[PDB]
Amino acid sequence: MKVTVIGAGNVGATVAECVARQDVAKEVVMVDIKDGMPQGKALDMRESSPIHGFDTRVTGTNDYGPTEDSDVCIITAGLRDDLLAKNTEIVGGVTEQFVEGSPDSTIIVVANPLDVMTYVAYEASGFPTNRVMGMAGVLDTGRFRSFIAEELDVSVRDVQALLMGGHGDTMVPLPRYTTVGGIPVPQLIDDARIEEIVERTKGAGGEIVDLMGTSAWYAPGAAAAEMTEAILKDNKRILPCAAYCDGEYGLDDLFIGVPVKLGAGGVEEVIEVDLDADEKAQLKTSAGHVHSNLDDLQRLRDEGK
Amino acid sequence: MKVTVIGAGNVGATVAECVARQDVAKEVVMVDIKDGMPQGKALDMRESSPIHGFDTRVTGTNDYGPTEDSDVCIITAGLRDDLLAKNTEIVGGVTEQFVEGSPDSTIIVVANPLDVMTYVAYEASGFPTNRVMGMAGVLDTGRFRSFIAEELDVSVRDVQALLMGGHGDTMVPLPRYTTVGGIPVPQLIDDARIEEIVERTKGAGGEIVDLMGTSAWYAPGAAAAEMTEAILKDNKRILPCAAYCDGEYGLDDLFIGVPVKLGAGGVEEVIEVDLDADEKAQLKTSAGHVHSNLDDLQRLRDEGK
Amino acid sequence: MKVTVIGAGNVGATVAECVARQDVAKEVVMVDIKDGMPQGKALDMRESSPIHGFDTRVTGTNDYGPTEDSDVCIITAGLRDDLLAKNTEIVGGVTEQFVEGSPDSTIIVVANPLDVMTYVAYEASGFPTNRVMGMAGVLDTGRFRSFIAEELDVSVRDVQALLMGGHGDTMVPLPRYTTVGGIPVPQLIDDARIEEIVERTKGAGGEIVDLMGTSAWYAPGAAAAEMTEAILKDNKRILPCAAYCDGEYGLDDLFIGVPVKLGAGGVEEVIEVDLDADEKAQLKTSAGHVHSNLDDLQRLRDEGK
Amino acid sequence: MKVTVIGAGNVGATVAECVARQDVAKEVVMVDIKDGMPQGKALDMRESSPIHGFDTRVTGTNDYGPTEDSDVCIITAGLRDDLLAKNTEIVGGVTEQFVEGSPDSTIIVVANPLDVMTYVAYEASGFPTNRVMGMAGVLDTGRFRSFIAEELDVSVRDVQALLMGGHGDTMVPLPRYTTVGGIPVPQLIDDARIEEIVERTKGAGGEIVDLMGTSAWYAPGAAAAEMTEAILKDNKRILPCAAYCDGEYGLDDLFIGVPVKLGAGGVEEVIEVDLDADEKAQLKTSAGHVHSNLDDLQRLRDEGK
């Protein structure tokens, strides 16, 4: 099996290196427009291979030829209307370039705004809906779990969480569907502290930008690599991702963050969890925000932007 | 760090090999009364070490000298009144033999009946209550999770469960504290099927005996090795184990299956989860059964048995 | 990918569990004639899967239906003329039963006498020579490396060794092709001690039988599982195995222990290392012994045995 | 156990993340002068911890307080006379700052020029010679092995190599002490191709700089993390590192690249491999170059630089 990562910056390179370390794929190919960068990073990773002990071949290139016949593609290239326009162009374009040579692939998008970029890639791909998804929920939940584990001083291995919706303010937290060793977290942490943690999770990306002046990559890269492993292994992970919904949660014709079953078939099922009145209202708001962005897309298209 | 496993039969040898494969401990020592068995198994494991790639030294012996200054001890030696008498003698005796040379150790008991044998070891040890525990819940939950994952066709990595109480009929299942990707399992599986799975979990040990004519070891060994890793790593796992309860769940002066935080301090906390009326009634019944066994212990002591 | 293990005794079950723990194959199937044993062991392994964290499905059966469309098969069923006759019957028979349903598989034999049983399986298989091999060298080298690492008090990770030929007296040790952190072992250990270690390696199987009264399984199982991983991953391991030689080392028409490149194509290359006069003489003797066994095969066939 | 990494740039952060992923240390602390960078990177790594599944706590700070009572320290801070002066100041200074709070630590230096910086740190540390070493050989050998594995199309797991001396032109390659599955590489690759690979290894750092415009970090970080693991695990790895030599190879009073045994005692032994006339001449030249740098140090000290 063969994996392509589009974009060889911090996030893309992290995806590539994490997939290569798993030693499941035969090859991982980084493609990027910047001459020499994917080549240098790939060479550095290959030189690390005997030390870590993986045989996955890592390649870097500026052309799409070497990405041909890929099984999985992770799209990380990407920098309100200006951004939507700029990233739409980047994501749509690289998707077109990629799918010509890999018609049987499954695509994982990591570009903002994430739910809308997932749709942009789906449309440019010509693939069925199950073959395109976005990484967000796994990062958001990894963050939430890390904060919970820190608060309780418990192993991260025993904290599980479900989060839905979009990123940031439109992210939909589900503390009652967050557990520690099977125990719902509201039994262990009080409401005010849970709400503090929810707010930190919503702003987590910006928090890191504020500290170091650029956005995260270790956790975003790990999250996309986990989704890649599930596809390659066909192991049926249940993870929250940006996925096409047809009727679930009463949403339709929409890519948004939902729990899914992931395997060789891409998004094999969208799981429907019970949401109470307030949670439905939050999800409705988040869906409204995705539709707003979709509307802006067409307006910007109309205007030649 | 150094680990002793008392008993070099199928379960003990599995504990030893699993701990050695983790490559955390410097040494693992199997001690057993049968001349040549722990020696042969340890030699076979050492000869496997370059193939698997672990440096943990595995030793086998018939004497307690080589177990001295151990950090963790897992007691697996062990074959109603006849059994209680026989295993009490074995477990109490090996505990006495062991603790003389390892006064600073933490003990994990794997002998039936499990809750009572955990007490027998505690009493023979002279250790504080936090330093002695029994393996049961991790095996029971591993079983329950495996059945759930099989039923839903989902990754075992995404199924979590909490079970309390004793083994078998007195095991206390908590399906509402069982989740798949964060989603409570009763939302996904209907009541009749959940009850089928609960009953299979209760009888799981006997099921294997009925198939192959002797009791399990891969899963019991893995479970005790997981508990050992938590102590060695001080990683604060939240796991159900037979632990001393002082007031939790309204139980007192009692070792029974409860969720605990495990680390270098042994049982560092007993976590109290919310139990509804029926669950409390089930736990009360299970506690009653442990007390019955404790009563039988003293009767058999009185009678010279 | 799918792996079958024929024989669910100590060695076969170890192969199965080790392959399942690697979490590379989708399924591992143990087949054995003894009702209930493979079923019980497979169930125990499945119940361990959430504790260890693997999604490979382990199945046990008494029939060959469930082994169909396997990619790799490891044959471990098997108990001088009496043994050769008995194991020839077992190995030839199970091979016939297996290949009917898995015509595209690669076979790894673990039955004694190993070089001759590898040929017996090849003949019963109808497969090309590259698709059938025997496990011996990886076990012998794992043993030799473990003894060297113990003698020097160095990591097993840094000791490498090459051994050729058959098992036991006809095993061909190559101390000058044995290194520690790249340093040939004769520079570190003196001749008399190297010869002690060579003799221990030759008798290692019997040593364990003498200690515990039955033969090893942890290291033999690990060795066959390593060979299985190489095929599944197509990672091009260079390992000593019983392989068909056409001209290499001047041997012809012969399965015997040689360094090979292993990948998806089975034995992809037989590597020819330089042997000095004494080493050639030893290999010639070992080949003579394999031919003797091959001769006995046909004599026993002639005699209706 | 606790690990400090001085410098939170690409290399230091890679060391930290690699050590944290091993899940052996309780805590890893990155310290760096740049406000916010180690904090941001550490937060990103902590948020990745539930996804990868490690409990090692990663901390970032601009002060040395949080590094106190560290067991291992990896020094990666650091940018001919100008460089020697600049890095001497950085390395000596951070060493002084660090050892005040961690008097029982072992130090691994990753700053250029590597052999001389290892001495600078040793002198600033007040530690015995066994407690200070430099990372170079493991990176150089990882590179050489990767090139060999690529050339032969074999697993990196089966290629081992020994390299001594300094970095670059003064690096001392030992192709006859380089093996593939135990087979010396000159038996498989011809002289001209081996020399090509040796020259590529010598210039490997510059090759990457030439491709991407900045120096490597995946492989350098992996190499220092491997050395850290050996100390933490006390596993007795035999690896080439910059270590203090007292009489070995006829060198004296000198830190230079040699094969060593690494464990809890730091550099526990310097192993002496047999060198032929040409190899001795190469090592003598490399030692001459280290002494030249040592001489320059004192000249620059004399001159107030």
Swiss-Prot record, chains A, B, C, D:
Positions of the catalytic residues: H167 (proton acceptor)
Its EC number(s): 1.1.1.37
Similarity section: Belongs to the LDH/MDH superfamily. MDH type 3 family.
UniProt-recorded name of the protein: Malate dehydrogenase
Catalytic reaction equation(s): (S)-malate + NAD(+) = oxaloacetate + NADH + H(+)
Binding, NAD(+): G7, A8, G9, N10, V11, G12, D32, N87, V110, A111, N112
Keyword Oxidoreductase (UniProt): yes
Database matches in InterPro entries: L-lactate/malate_DH, Lactate/malate_DH_C, Lactate/malate_DH_N, Lactate_DH/Glyco_Ohase_4_C, Malate_DH_type3, NAD(P)-bd_dom_sf
Alphabetical list of HAMAP family matching this protein: Malate_dehydrog_3
The organism of origin for this protein: Salinibacter ruber (strain DSM 13855 / M31)
Alphabetized GO MF terms: L-lactate dehydrogenase activity; L-malate dehydrogenase (NAD+) activity
UniProt signal peptide: none
